[PDB]
Design a protein around this ligand. Sequence first.
Ligand SMILES: Cc1ccc(F)cc1C(N)=O
Length: 209
Amino acid sequence: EVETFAFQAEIAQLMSLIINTFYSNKEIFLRELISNSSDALDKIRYESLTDPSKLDSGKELHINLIPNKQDRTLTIVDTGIGMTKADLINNLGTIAKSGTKAFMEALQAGADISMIGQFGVGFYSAYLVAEKVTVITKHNDDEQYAWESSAGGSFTVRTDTGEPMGRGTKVILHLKEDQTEYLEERRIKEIVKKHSQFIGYPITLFVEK
Ligand SMILES: Cc1ccc(F)cc1C(N)=O
């Protein structure tokens, strides 16, 4: 059972701008997704300070980067607070409408796309490198869900019957054919060292056979 939703017009406009604007510095998508994972990990950590049972779904707080050249996917996994179904539908827990408005004004006022994270909509930078994004998520207060979009104005939400996650979020980037450099170990290592060297959670880059 799959539900299909329209993006709000402003979010569709943001995604088309990200997809259609010529901009070579695409690597910042990974910084933005790792920063989102760090924010989600901070949230479950804070909740656990006064209620340790919040970590019954998993005590480890970490970020995994999983490249798969056979599937042409880069997956960013975190054990953060996750997202409810309502969060997913509401632009993946962001204030994306007002964030997009602030971002697009900054662009005609001298800012550039690499600054997207300052406006709370860094998730959508995934579409710099991905033709399709799948988000698997599990929040303590809801069931496991799969969000997915290939842009084009719509996204889907369904209950996820896949591998149980415990708690957190998995962002699966189905990479564009010409963006496979982001599956190479040395390229991922370089980006993490350049942009994410001070993230306060272990970032583990998985290797492939
Ligand atoms: C350069 C760029 C790419 C994508 C985007 F969404 C915005 C911009 C910008 N800085 O105007």
